[PDB]
């Protein structure tokens, strides 16, 4: 949350920057790459039952304070290349990390001049349906994918099926 | 060479003048090897030393089974000049310092002059040497060397005058 | 990196080509390209170098800049001629902080510097709003003992390239024994391009004047040849700093004949050992021996005249023959080296460097030349006579360091020196090549990594640089 408002920057670009192995030089290794890191080996490494918290976590403060998509991309790396832990033990809350990606989605739909990116989150939903929720949240996502945004609705029609 | 052993030296041409010559041994002991690197006298050809010009750099530098009377450097820019050199051992003459192991290696010059020629052939399955074989001329120690434009003039070194070429890539020499 | 690791130096006009090759050759957009130009700038003197380079580094990052003030003067036209494209391009790379927090943690006063760099280049770049911009970096690092280097050299670089602005003689040697008291950092700023060929030229042709005539004042006549030994000493050493761009700039134009001798075969990436018996022994049979008994028995200081410099060599045939060849003289010739081993006396390594690498090129069963050059390097010239030059003490510094740039297959070869340098650290580029090890890791070894790395890996460039010229293109 550093401008939020004005220009987060121009170099905002999530790709490069959350990429790791850029430490390998002195440049390119921003505190927020740091960060990143250090919760990804946190997180697997304390893969038991510490996941518990981070749904009340993501609820309470990680949902009011995203307007712009790199936040986005930053939280999916945080909590994303985990459904694995979750599908295997902690199926009570996959369903809630589920909801909160779609949450993460309407909020940076609602508040858009336009998106730039749809096929990263489009095929990164997409994986994390075919792998992880399968068919069981249809009922219930429909209910959030209904009143979104035209462009958006079009483009992740194929979900009902 | 002379001895049991093998020796090598050249790293570039005429360019620079180092020659790491490397007198190897490899019978030390059942499967394994102690290859030495002693440093014999190194030379090079004194044909830099024209102050006209110095683009020889040569591009064969062959030898031959008697290591001890030749050097084939030879000026081969687009150039031609063969060289010779040899191993005559001497001391040096210790005097001036007052008022009256000194062998040494220092290589000679024997012969070498300007010619126009690029590919050499071969060096010598040759005789022996130290005997005036004036009235022998068979292919003793003979010496062949091709030339671009067509015919080959062949001629034994120390010579170079001219053989029988009779008139109308790379080779070698088939045999004597 | 590569132009900044390989020709720092000898810049006559390569930044021309240089830009008209990244500017045409080249598909950068303007943002993007100017960001790149400035992260390779400032990604520099950080990894490789830890001695001399560093100067040699930062001076290169500095001389950067007029090259993009070039860039501005003719790459763009009446098209955002450079008004806010670079003041949001480095308001961008200020949220690079680690690079910068590195530059930091390395020179422990880089933020200082880098404000000082950025306002100075603001005084000759455009500066019209900028401040702006200094201010934001300056809130940019909010939380993050006598004279830092990089300040007093770019300050005092202009000082020295218009030291005196006077081509004259008659003065005094106070002007480089100042030099001779700081590092080679004088150079380091002279690399500027600006002054660098004009200076060497001034310089040989002040040397190649001050020939000091022949006098009878022994004081006056002893300070200017121990001043013109310092002097050769120093040109010797900013010599074998950058080697074939010191020749250039002293062997490009001119109907002349200065004193090429000791500079085209005393030291370069060339062995030229097997050549020095038999180029350089110009030794006619006038005087050959008068100067060599005068040389060897000196302790003949009459008046200043040093031209057997040139001549030398047949001094040190003489000894190496008597000394042990020959066994006239057992101790005798330790004598007549430690009275070569005199002050204001520098040329005298050159010739045994030379005939050194000659002895190299024989047999080397011998070894003459190694106790000659180990006897050399020993603390014998400690002070012990009475040697008139005052900057000993430097001059050795010079000699060290020249005799061991050379003769490394000697340094290497036999017995290990007694460390006659008592520096910070010697050239870290070198061969760094196993030995018993095959070709087959040029690819396993630096490929590898620069693939996944971010650079072109400035350290092996100096080893792709040898392996290039060592093997075949093909």
Not at chain 3, 181 to 207: H, Y
């Given at each position: 949350?550093?401008?939020?408002?004005?220009?987060?920057?121009?170099?905002?670009?999530?790709?490069?920057?959350?990429?790791?192995?850029?430490?390998?030089?002195?440049?390119?290794?921003?505190?927020?790459?740091?960060?990143?890191?250090?919760?990804?080996?946190?997180?697997?490494?304390?893969?038991?039952?510490?996941?518990?918290?981070?749904?009340?976590?993501?609820?309470?403060?990680?949902?009011?304070?995203?307007?712009?998509?790199?936040?986005?991309?930053?939280?999916?790396?945080?909590?994303?290349?985990?459904?694995?832990?979750?599908?295997?033990?902690?199926?009570?809350?996959?369903?809630?990390?589920?909801?909160?990606?779609?949450?993460?989605?309407?909020?940076?739909?609602?508040?858009?001049?336009?998106?730039?990116?749809?096929?990263?989150?489009?095929?990164?939903?997409?994986?994390?349906?075919?792998?992880?929720?399968?068919?069981?949240?249809?009922?219930?996502?429909?209910?959030?994918?209904?009143?979104?945004?035209?462009?958006?609705?079009?483009?992740?029609?194929?979900?009902?099926? | 060479?002379?001895?049991?052993?093998?020796?090598?030296?050249?790293?570039?041409?005429?360019?620079?003048?180092?020659?790491?010559?490397?007198?190897?041994?490899?019978?030390?002991?059942?499967?394994?090897?102690?290859?030495?690197?002693?440093?014999?006298?190194?030379?090079?050809?004194?044909?830099?030393?024209?102050?006209?010009?110095?683009?020889?750099?040569?591009?064969?530098?062959?030898?031959?089974?008697?290591?001890?009377?030749?050097?084939?450097?030879?000026?081969?820019?687009?150039?031609?000049?063969?060289?010779?050199?040899?191993?005559?051992?001497?001391?040096?003459?210790?005097?001036?310092?007052?008022?009256?192991?000194?062998?040494?290696?220092?290589?000679?010059?024997?012969?070498?002059?300007?010619?126009?020629?690029?590919?050499?052939?071969?060096?010598?399955?040759?005789?022996?040497?130290?005997?005036?074989?004036?009235?022998?001329?068979?292919?003793?120690?003979g010496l062949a060397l091709a030339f671009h434009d067509g015919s080959?003039?062949?001629?034994?070194?120390?010579?170079?005058?001219?053989?029988?070429?009779?008139?109308?890539?790379?080779?070698?020499?088939?045999?004597? | 990196?590569?132009?900044?690791?390989?020709?720092?130096?000898?810049?006559?006009?390569?930044?021309?080509?240089?830009?008209?090759?990244?500017?045409?050759?080249?598909?950068?957009?303007?943002?993007?390209?100017?960001?790149?130009?400035?992260?390779?700038?400032?990604?520099?003197?950080?990894?490789?170098?830890?001695?001399?380079?560093?100067?040699?580094?930062?001076?290169?990052?500095?001389?950067?800049?007029?090259?993009?003030?070039?860039?501005?003067?003719?790459?763009?036209?009446?098209?955002?001629?450079?008004?806010?494209?670079?003041?949001?391009?480095?308001?961008?790379?200020?949220?690079?902080?680690?690079?910068?927090?590195?530059?930091?943690?390395?020179?422990?006063?880089?933020?200082?510097?880098?404000?000082?760099?950025?306002?100075?280049?603001?005084?000759?770049?455009?500066?019209?709003?900028?401040?702006?911009?200094?201010?934001?970096?300056?809130?940019?690092?909010?939380?993050?003992?006598?004279?830092?280097?990089?300040?007093?050299?770019?300050?005092?670089?202009?000082?020295?390239?218009?030291?005196?602005?006077?081509?004259?003689?008659?003065?005094?040697?106070?002007?480089?024994?100042?030099?001779?008291?700081?590092?080679?950092?004088?150079?380091?700023?002279?690399?500027?391009?600006?002054?660098?060929?004009?200076?060497?030229?001034?310089?040989?042709?002040?040397?190649?004047?001050?020939?000091?005539?022949?006098?009878?004042?022994?004081?006056?006549?002893?300070?200017?040849?121990?001043?013109?030994?310092?002097?050769?000493?120093?040109?010797?050493?900013?010599?074998?700093?950058?080697?074939?761009?010191?020749?250039?700039?002293?062997?490009?134009?001119?109907?002349?004949?200065?004193?090429?001798?000791?500079?085209?075969?005393?030291?370069?990436?060339?062995?030229?050992?097997?050549?020095?018996?038999?180029?350089?022994?110009?030794?006619?049979?006038?005087?050959?021996?008068?100067?060599?008994?005068?040389?060897?028995?000196?302790?003949?200081?009459?008046?200043?005249?040093?031209?057997?410099?040139?001549?030398?060599?047949?001094?040190?045939?003489?000894?190496?023959?008597?000394?042990?060849?020959?066994?006239?003289?057992?101790?005798?010739?330790?004598?007549?080296?430690?009275?070569?081993?005199?002050?204001?006396?520098?040329?005298?390594?050159?010739?045994?460097?030379?005939?050194?690498?000659?002895?190299?090129?024989?047999?080397?069963?011998?070894?003459?030349?190694?106790?000659?050059?180990?006897?050399?390097?020993?603390?014998?010239?400690?002070?012990?006579?009475?040697?008139?030059?005052?900057?000993?003490?430097?001059?050795?510094?010079?000699?060290?360091?020249?005799?061991?740039?050379?003769?490394?297959?000697?340094?290497?070869?036999?017995?290990?020196?007694?460390?006659?340098?008592?520096?910070?650290?010697?050239?870290?580029?070198?061969?760094?090549?196993?030995?018993?090890?095959?070709?087959?890791?040029?690819?396993?070894?630096?490929?590898?990594?620069?693939?996944?790395?971010?650079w072109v890996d400035s350290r092996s460039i100096h080893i792709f640089?040898?392996?290039?010229?060592?093997?075949?293109?093909?």
């Amino acid at each position: 949350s550093p401008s939020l408002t004005s220009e987060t920057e121009w170099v905002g670009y999530p790709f490069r920057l959350f990429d790791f192995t850029a430490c390998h030089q002195s440049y390119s290794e921003m505190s927020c790459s740091y960060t990143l890191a250090l919760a990804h080996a946190v997180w697997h490494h304390s893969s038991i039952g510490q996941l518990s918290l981070i749904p009340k976590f993501l609820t309470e403060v990680l949902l009011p304070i995203v307007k712009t998509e790199f936040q986005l991309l930053y939280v999916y790396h945080l909590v994303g290349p985990f459904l694995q832990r979750f599908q295997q033990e902690r199926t009570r809350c996959m369903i809630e990390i589920g909801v909160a990606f779609y949450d993460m989605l309407l909020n940076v739909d609602q508040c858009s001049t336009h998106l730039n990116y749809m096929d990263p989150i489009c095929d990164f939903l997409y994986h994390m349906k075919y792998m992880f929720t399968g068919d069981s949240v249809k009922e219930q996502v429909e209910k959030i994918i209904c009143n979104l945004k035209p462009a958006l609705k079009l483009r992740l029609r194929f979900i009902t099926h | 060479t002379g001895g049991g052993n093998i020796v090598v030296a050249t790293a570039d041409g005429s360019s620079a003048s180092p020659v790491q010559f490397y007198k190897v041994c490899v019978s030390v002991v059942s499967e394994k090897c102690r290859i030495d690197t002693e440093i014999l006298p190194s030379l090079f050809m004194r044909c830099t030393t024209d102050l006209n010009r110095k683009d020889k750099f040569p591009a064969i530098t062959h030898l031959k089974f008697l290591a001890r009377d030749m050097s084939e450097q030879v000026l081969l820019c687009a150039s031609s000049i063969v060289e010779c050199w040899s191993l005559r051992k001497e001391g040096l003459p210790v005097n001036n310092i007052f008022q009256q192991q000194p062998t040494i290696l220092k290589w000679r010059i024997l012969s070498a002059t300007n010619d126009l020629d690029r590919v050499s052939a071969v060096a010598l399955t040759n005789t022996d040497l130290k005997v005036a074989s004036d009235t022998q001329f068979y292919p003793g120690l003979g010496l062949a060397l091709a030339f671009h434009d067509g015919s080959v003039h062949i001629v034994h070194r120390l010579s170079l005058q001219t053989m029988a070429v009779f008139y109308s890539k790379a080779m070698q020499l088939s045999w004597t | 990196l590569l132009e900044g690791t390989m020709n720092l130096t000898g810049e006559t006009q390569s930044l021309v080509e240089q830009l008209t090759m990244v500017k045409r050759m080249q598909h950068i957009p303007t943002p993007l390209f100017v960001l790149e130009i400035w992260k390779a700038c400032f990604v520099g003197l950080i990894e490789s170098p830890e001695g001399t380079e560093e100067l040699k580094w930062t001076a290169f990052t500095f001389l950067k800049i007029p090259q993009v003030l070039v860039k501005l003067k003719k790459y763009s036209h009446g098209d955002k001629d450079f008004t806010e494209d670079v003041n949001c391009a480095f308001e961008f790379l200020l949220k690079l902080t680690p690079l910068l927090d590195k530059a930091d943690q390395r020179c422990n006063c880089d933020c200082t510097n880098f404000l000082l760099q950025e306002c100075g280049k603001q005084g000759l770049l455009s500066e019209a709003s900028v401040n702006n911009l200094m201010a934001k970096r300056k809130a940019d690092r909010e939380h993050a003992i006598l004279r830092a280097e990089p300040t007093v050299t770019n300050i005092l670089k202009t000082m020295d390239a218009d030291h005196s602005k006077s081509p004259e003689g008659l003065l005094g040697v106070l002007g480089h024994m100042l030099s001779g008291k700081s590092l080679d950092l004088l150079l380091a700023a002279a690399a500027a391009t600006g002054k660098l060929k004009s200076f060497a030229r001034k310089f040989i042709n002040l040397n190649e004047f001050t020939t000091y005539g022949s006098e009878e004042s022994t004081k006056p006549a002893s300070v200017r040849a121990l001043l013109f030994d310092i002097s050769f000493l120093m040109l010797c050493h900013v010599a074998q700093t950058y080697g074939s761009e010191v020749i250039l700039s002293e062997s490009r134009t001119g109907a002349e004949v200065p004193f090429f001798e000791t500079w085209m075969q005393t030291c370069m990436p060339e062995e030229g050992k097997i050549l020095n018996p038999d180029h350089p022994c110009f030794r006619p049979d006038s005087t050959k021996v008068e100067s060599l008994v005068a040389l060897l028995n000196n302790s003949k200081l009459v008046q200043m005249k040093w031209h057997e410099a040139c001549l030398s060599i047949s001094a040190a045939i003489l000894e190496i023959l008597n000394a042990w060849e020959n066994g006239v003289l057992a101790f005798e010739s330790i004598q007549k080296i430690t009275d070569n081993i005199k002050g204001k006396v520098c040329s005298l390594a050159v010739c045994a460097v030379a005939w050194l690498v000659a002895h190299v090129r024989m047999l080397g069963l011998d070894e003459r030349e190694k106790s000659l050059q180990m006897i050399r390097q020993l603390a014998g010239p400690l002070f012990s006579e009475n040697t008139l030059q005052f900057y000993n003490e430097r001059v050795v510094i010079m000699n060290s360091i020249l005799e061991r740039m050379c003769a490394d297959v000697l340094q290497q070869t036999a017995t290990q020196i007694k460390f006659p340098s008592t520096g910070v650290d010697t050239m870290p580029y070198w061969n760094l090549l196993p030995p018993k090890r095959p070709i087959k890791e040029v690819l396993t070894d630096i490929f590898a990594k620069v693939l996944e790395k971010g650079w072109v890996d400035s350290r092996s460039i100096h080893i792709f640089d040898t392996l290039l010229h060592m093997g075949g293109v093909y």
